[PDB]
From a paper:
We further succeeded in determination of a low-resolution LRP6PE3PE4-DKK1CRD2-KRM1ECD complex, defining the architecture of the Wnt inhibitory complex that leads to [name] cell-surface depletion. Diffraction data collected from the resulting crystals were highly anisotropic with diffraction extending in the best directions to 3.5 Å and 3.7 Å but only to 6.4 Å in the third direction. Despite the lack of high-resolution diffraction, the general architecture of the ternary complex is revealed. DKK1CRD2 is sandwiched between LRP6PE3 and KRM1Kringle-WSC. KRM1ECD does indeed bind on the opposite side of DKK1CRD2 with only its KR and WSC domains engaged in binding. Although present in the complex subjected to crystallization, we observe no density that could correspond to CRD1 or the domain linker (L). Overall, the [name]-[name] interface is characterized by a large number of polar interactions but only few hydrophobic contacts. The crystal structure gives an explanation for [name] loss-of-binding mutations identified previously (Wang et al., 2008): R191 of [name] forms a double salt bridge to D125 and E162 of [name]. Similarly, the K226 side chain of [name], which points to a small hydrophobic pocket on the surface of [name] formed by Y108, W94, and W106, forms salt bridges with the side chains of [name] D88 and D90. The LRP6PE3PE4-DKK1CRD2-KRM1ECD complex structure reveals no direct interactions between [name] and [name].
Numbering used by the authors:
A (entry chain B): 30 to 97, 103 to 322
B (entry chain A): 628 to 1005, 1013 to 1246
C (entry chain C): 182 to 249, 259 to 266
C-alpha cells in the first residue's frame, strides 16, 4: 500500500493518470506556473512536488489529484487505500450496506463515525454524504458493488481534509482504526494513533497487542510519524517481559524499518497535555 | 454617534464582535440557544442586534449586553437566509429561500405581511434603503439575478440579470453603489443604484462570501482562507486581513450610526399608519397592513380579512385567501399550538377555537395569537367541536364519556344534550339557523349519521347503510345541503338537510378525507395521505380543482364568511339568548323555545332551567 | 419518498425529478437542472469542499458547459 492517510497526503507513487482506464494525462508540477502549486513555489520537494506528473495532494484535500473549465481531476489510484479503509461501496437504499445503527452529525469525521460504531460494538463503520454515519457487523457491505474511490470524495462535515462517502456511496472503515487499544493477530496489519485520521487527543494512554503465533520475527515500519512534542512518545514493549524495546518521540524519529525477533509485541502511545499532531501509522509484517 | 465603528459577524453557534484593526480583541456576544446563525443586521437607536437561525427556523433579537433574548419570527420559516432592519420605519424585512417569500413586519414581530410571493425562486441576500424607499435582493434560481422593488413590494424589476449566486448585498449610501460577492465566479463586483456601470473590484479571491462596507473600504469574509479581510472599495487594493482562523463565517456587518442615516415620513409618528409604514420612492411612503388585511379608503387604517379559509395541520393552524394574486397561505402565530385535532371560528368576536388532542382541552385565541385562554379542561377527551355563534355556545363531542357536551365561550358549562350506553358521537356540525345539529354516531358494527335538535330532542337516523367510517361532516345553510366523507369507502357524498336525495359527489382518486367545509358555491375538503386541499363545484358548472399540495398531517378545514350583523340579529337567539338560561331552540315556524340539558328541566317561566 | 425540500441522505431517497444535495449542514431534495439553467463549476479545488449550497446535476443528455463567467446545462 502506497497510502497510510485518509486523503493520500503521503502518496509518493508513479501514477500520472486521473484513472488507469478512461483517464486524462496529468500535467507536470515543474510547468504549472499558472496555478498555485508548482516546483518554484515549493523548492526542497515540499508536499511531494518535483520534476514529474505523478498525482499528489499538497493542498490537503480529500484525495490525490493532478492538473490536466476543468483544469484538474481527482486521481483514481488503486494502491492508495489506507489499511483499514475497506473501500468505497454503493448504497441503493433499503436495506443499507451496514444495517446495525446510524446517526447524523454536523461535525462528522471518519474517526467520530468510527468511535460511534466502536462504542456500540460494531466491527465496521461507514460514512455517507459527508455527514451520515452507519454501523454494522455485516460481512456483505459489498452487496451493492464496489465503486471508484473518487465517488467517495465528499468532504467530512467536521474535517475538510477527509473523505466521507458521497451521493449513494459509502466509504467503509474497520473500527480498529484509531481505537485506543486493540488486538492484532494477522500476518500484516497497520496500527494508527488514537483518534486517527483526526489529530490525536491530549492525555491519551493507549496500547495495542500485536501477537502472531508462529512468527520468527516482525518487521516494523513507520510510513507516517508526525508526533509533535518530546513528552509525546510511541513505545514498543516486549509482550512477555514488558521491557521497553524502543522509544520514539518528537525529537527522535524511527528508522525506515527494523526487525524484532518476537511473536508478541505491545505497541504503546502516550500523549501529553501541550500540542496535538496527525499522529502515526505503524505497519508490521510477521515472518515465518 | 461618538463610539468608533466596530465589526460584528455571525459564525454558526455564536455571533462575535471585533474592531477594524488587524489582530485585535475578539469577543463573542453572550447569547443563549443559538444553533446556526446565518443573516445579521442591527438597530443603533435601540442598541440591538437581529439575526436569523436556519436550524431553529427563527428570527431573533437581543441587546449588545445579551439581555432581552426574544424570537421575533418563529412560524412559517424554512430557510431565512436574508434579513434586514428598516431603522427609520421600525420594520423587519427578510427573505426565505425555502418558502420563496419576501416578508415584512414590525421589529417586535407583529403585523406580518408578504410583499413578494409570485415569481420568486430562492431570494438569498437582502439590502434595504428606507431613506430612498427601495429594497434590493439577490435571487438564486435557475437564472440567478439581483432584483429591486419599493419597500411596500411595488414596482418590482430585475436590476442586473447576468450574474451568478450573489451574496452579501450591501449599499454604499455615500457614493450610491451596490456591492456583492459572487460564489460561482469568486469575485466582488460593484454597480450603481440602477445596476449599470458594472465594475469588478476584486477577481483574485479564493472564496469570498459575506460582505459589508464603511467609509472607503469593503469588509468581506472568506471560507477558503478562513479570514475577515478588507480592501479599497473602488480600487480593490490596500488589502489587509483583519482576523484569521475563523471557520464558516456567514454574514459580516459594520455597527455604526452613520450606516443607519437618512430620513422619511415613516420616522415621524409612523406616517399616521394604523399597522405598518412602508417607504416608497415616489410619494414618500404608503401605509401597509398585515397579511390578508384590507387597507381602507383613507390610506391609513386597516381591517382584518372579510372572508378567508382556515385549514389546520397537526402542529399549526393556517389561513388562506381567494385573491387574484394567489396570495400565499400563512401560519397563524399561536404559541400554544402543539397537537390540534379540530378547529372552528367565531366571526362575532373574531377568535379561533381548537381541540388539543395530547393535552385534552378546548383552547381559544385570536388570529394574532394573543388573548390565549383554555375554555375546557380535565377525565375528558374532546374529539370534535362546532360553535353556535348565535347562542354563544360550543357543541363538542367527548371520546371518553361518549356525549355531545355543550359549553359557553367564556368557560362555564351548559350541560350534556345527548348521552347513551351504546351511543358514540364523534363528528359534529351545528345548524342553529334552522335549529338542528348533525353528528356521526359510530356505534359498534353499525355506523350511522343522525339529526337532532340542539337540546337532544327529535332524534332520527338519516343514514344507516353504505357507511363504514363517517369521519367528517359539513353543511350549507343557504342551499340546505348536508355533506359527509367516508375514510374506508373513500368517497364524499351529499344530501338534503331532511335526508332525501342521497348522491355520491366523488368516489375516485380519494384516499383519506378528514375534513369538509363550504365556501360560497364550492365544497372544500382535505386529504391526509394525498396531502392536498381540493374542491368541487356544488352546482356542477366547473370541474374538480386542486387548491394546494404537499401539506403534511392535515387535520381539519373550516371556511369563514364575514358576519352580516343586521341579518345576524334577525335570528331570535342572537340578542339575549332568546331570553333563555341554557339552550335556545328554533321551531319549524321561525319561533324560539327555551330548552335545557339532560340533567335540567324547563320551569314554569319557560326560560330558566332547574333540576328534577 | 422525499419531496422538494425534504431531508434526504442519498438521491435514491428523493423523487424521480429530484437529487439529494447539501444546503448548509444537512442534505435536502433539490430539483435536477434542465437546458438553460445555471449549473455549478468549481474554479479552485478547495471550493468543492467549502460548497454548502450544492446544485443538482444537469439532466439526461445535458452537460455543464460555459455560456455563449457562468456555466449552464447544454446538450452534447
Ligand atoms: Ca499532546
Amino acid at each position: 500500500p502506497e497510502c497510510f492517510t485518509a486523503n493520500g497526503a503521503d502518496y509518493r507513487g508513479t501514477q500520472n493518470w486521473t484513472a488507469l482506464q478512461g483517464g486524462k494525462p496529468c500535467l507536470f508540477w515543474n510547468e504549472t506556473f499558472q496555478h498555485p502549486y508548482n516546483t518554484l513555489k515549493y523548492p526542497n520537494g515540499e508536499g511531494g512536488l518535483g520534476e514529474h506528473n505523478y498525482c499528489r495532494n499538497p493542498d490537503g484535500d480529500v484525495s490525490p489529484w493532478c492538473y490536466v473549465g476543468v483544469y484538474w481531476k481527482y486521481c483514481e489510484i488503486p494502491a492508495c487505500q489506507m489499511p483499514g479503509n475497506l473501500g468505497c461501496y454503493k448504497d441503493h437504499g433499503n436495506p443499507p450496506p451496514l444495517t446495525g445503527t446510524s446517526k447524523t452529525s454536523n461535525k462528522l469525521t471518519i474517526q467520530t463515525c468510527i468511535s460511534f460504531c466502536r462504542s456500540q460494538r460494531f466491527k465496521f463503520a461507514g460514512m455517507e454524504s459527508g455527514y451520515a454515519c452507519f454501523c454494522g457487523n455485516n460481512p456483505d457491505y459489498w452487496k451493492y458493488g464496489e465503486a471508484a474511490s473518487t465517488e467517495c470524495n465528499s468532504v467530512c462535515f467536521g474535517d475538510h481534509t477527509q473523505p466521507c462517502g458521497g451521493d449513494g456511496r459509502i466509504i467503509l472503515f474497520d473500527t480498529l482504526v484509531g481505537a485506543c487499544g486493540g488486538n492484532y493477530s494477522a500476518m500484516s496489519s497497520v496500527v494508527y494513533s488514537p483518534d486517527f485520521p483526526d489529530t490525536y487527543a491530549t492525555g491519551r494512554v493507549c496500547y495495542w497487542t500485536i501477537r502472531v503465533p508462529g512468527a520468527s520475527h516482525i518487521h516494523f515500519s513507520f510510513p507516517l510519524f508526525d508526533i509533535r512534542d518530546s513528552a509525546d512518545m510511541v513505545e514498543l514493549l516486549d509482550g512477555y517481559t514488558h521491557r521497553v524495546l524502543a522509544r520514539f518521540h518528537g525529537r527522535s524519529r524511527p528508522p525506515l524499518s527494523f526487525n524484532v525477533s518476537l511473536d508478541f509485541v505491545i505497541l504503546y502511545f502516550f500523549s501529553d497535555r501541550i500540542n496535538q499532531a496527525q499522529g502515526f501509522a505503524v505497519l508490521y509484517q510477521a515472518v515465518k | 454617534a461618538d463610539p468608533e465603528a466596530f465589526l460584528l459577524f455571525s459564525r454558526r453557534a455564536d455571533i462575535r464582535r471585533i474592531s477594524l484593526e488587524t489582530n485585535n480583541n475578539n469577543v463573542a456576544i453572550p447569547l443563549t440557544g443559538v444553533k446556526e446563525a446565518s443573516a445579521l443586521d442591527f438597530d443603533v437607536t435601540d442598541n440591538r442586534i437581529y439575526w436569523t437561525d436556519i436550524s431553529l427556523k427563527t428570527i431573533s433579537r437581543a441587546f449588545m449586553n445579551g439581555s432581552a433574548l426574544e424570537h421575533v419570527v418563529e412560524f412559517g420559516l424554512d430557510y431565512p437566509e436574508g434579513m434586514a432592519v428598516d431603522w427609520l420605519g421600525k420594520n423587519l424585512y427578510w427573505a426565505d429561500t425555502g418558502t420563496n417569500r419576501i416578508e415584512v413586519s414590525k421589529l417586535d414581530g407583529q403585523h406580518r405581511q408578504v410583499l413578494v410571493w409570485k415569481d420568486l425562486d430562492s431570494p438569498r441576500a437582502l439590502a434595504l434603503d428606507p431613506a430612498e424607499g427601495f429594497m434590493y435582493w439577490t435571487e438564486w434560481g435557475g437564472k440567478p439575478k439581483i432584483d429591486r422593488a419599493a419597500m411596500d413590494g411595488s414596482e418590482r424589476t430585475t436590476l442586473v440579470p447576468n450574474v451568478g449566486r450573489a451574496n452579501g448585498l450591501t449599499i454604499d449610501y455615500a457614493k450610491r453603489r451596490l456591492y456583492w460577492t459572487d460564489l460561482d465566479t469568486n469575485l466582488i463586483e460593484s454597480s450603481n443604484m440602477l445596476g449599470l456601470n458594472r465594475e469588478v473590484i476584486a477577481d483574485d479571491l479564493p472564496h469570498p462570501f459575506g460582505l459589508t462596507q464603511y467609509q472607503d473600504y469593503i469588509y468581506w469574509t472568506d471560507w477558503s482562507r478562513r479570514s475577515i479581510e478588507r480592501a479599497n472599495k473602488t480600487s480593490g487594493q490596500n488589502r489587509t486581513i483583519i482576523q484569521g482562523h475563523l471557520d464558516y463565517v456567514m454574514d459580516i456587518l459594520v455597527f455604526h450610526s452613520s450606516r443607519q442615516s437618512g430620513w422619511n415620513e415613516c420616522a415621524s409618528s409612523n406616517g399616521h399608519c394604523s399597522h405598518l409604514c412602508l417607504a416608497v420612492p415616489v410619494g414618500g411612503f404608503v401605509c401597509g397592513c398585515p397579511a390578508h388585511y384590507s387597507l381602507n379608503a383613507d390610506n391609513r387604517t386597516c381591517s382584518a380579512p372579510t372572508t378567508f379559509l382556515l385549514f389546520s395541520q397537526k402542529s399549526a393552524i393556517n389561513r388562506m385567501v381567494i385573491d387574484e394574486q394567489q396570495s400565499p397561505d400563512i401560519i397563524l402565530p399561536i404559541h400554544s399550538l402543539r397537537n390540534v385535532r379540530a378547529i372552528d371560528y367565531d366571526p362575532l368576536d373574531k377568535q379561533l377555537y381548537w381541540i388539543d388532542s395530547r393535552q385534552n382541552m378546548i383552547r381559544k385565541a385570536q388570529e394574532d395569537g394573543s388573548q390565549g385562554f383554555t375554555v375546557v379542561v380535565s377525565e375528558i377527551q374532546p374529539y370534535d367541536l362546532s360553535i353556535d355563534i348565535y347562542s354563544r355556545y360550543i357543541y363538542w363531542t367527548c371520546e371518553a364519556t361518549n356525549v355531545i357536551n355543550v359549553t359557553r365561550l367564556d368557560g362555564r358549562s351548559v350541560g350534556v344534550v345527548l348521552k347513551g350506553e351504546q351511543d358514540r358521537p364523534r363528528a359534529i356540525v351545528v345548524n342553529p339557523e334552522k335549529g338542528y345539529m348533525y353528528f356521526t354516531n359510530l356505534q359498534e358494527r353499525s355506523p350511522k349519521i343522525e339529526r337532532a335538535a340542539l337540546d337532544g330532542t327529535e332524534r332520527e337516523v338519516l343514514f344507516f347503510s353504505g357507511l363504514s367510517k363517517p369521519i367528517a361532516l359539513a353543511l350549507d345553510s343557504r342551499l340546505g345541503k348536508l355533506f359527509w366523507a367516508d375514510s374506508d369507502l373513500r368517497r364524499i357524498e351529499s344530501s338534503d338537510l331532511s335526508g332525501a336525495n342521497r348522491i355520491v359527489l366523488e368516489d375516485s382518486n380519494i384516499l383519506q378525507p378528514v375534513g369538509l367545509t363550504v365556501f360560497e358555491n364550492w365544497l372544500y375538503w382535505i386529504d391526509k395521505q394525498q396531502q392536498m386541499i381540493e374542491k368541487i363545484d356544488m352546482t356542477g358548472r366547473e370541474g374538480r380543482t386542486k387548491v394546494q399540495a404537499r401539506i403534511a398531517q392535515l387535520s381539519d378545514i373550516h371556511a369563514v364568511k364575514e358576519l352580516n350583523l343586521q341579518e345576524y340579529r334577525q335570528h331570535p337567539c342572537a340578542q339575549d339568548n332568546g331570553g333563555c338560561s341554557h339552550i335556545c331552540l328554533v321551531k319549524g315556524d321561525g319561533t324560539t323555545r327555551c330548552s335545557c340539558p339532560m340533567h335540567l328541566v324547563l320551569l314554569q317561566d319557560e326560560l330558566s332551567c332547574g333540576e328534577p | 419518498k422525499g419531496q422538494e425540500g425534504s431531508v434526504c441522505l442519498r438521491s435514491s431517497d428523493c423523487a424521480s425529478g429530484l437529487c439529494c444535495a447539501r444546503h448548509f449542514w444537512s442534505k435536502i431534495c433539490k430539483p435536477v437542472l434542465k437546458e438553460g439553467q445555471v449549473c455549478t463549476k468549481h474554479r479552485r479545488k478547495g471550493s468543492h469542499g467549502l460548497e454548502i449550497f450544492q446544485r443538482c446535476y444537469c439532466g439526461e443528455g445535458l452537460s455543464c458547459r460555459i455560456q455563449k463567467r457562468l456555466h449552464t446545462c447544454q446538450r452534447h
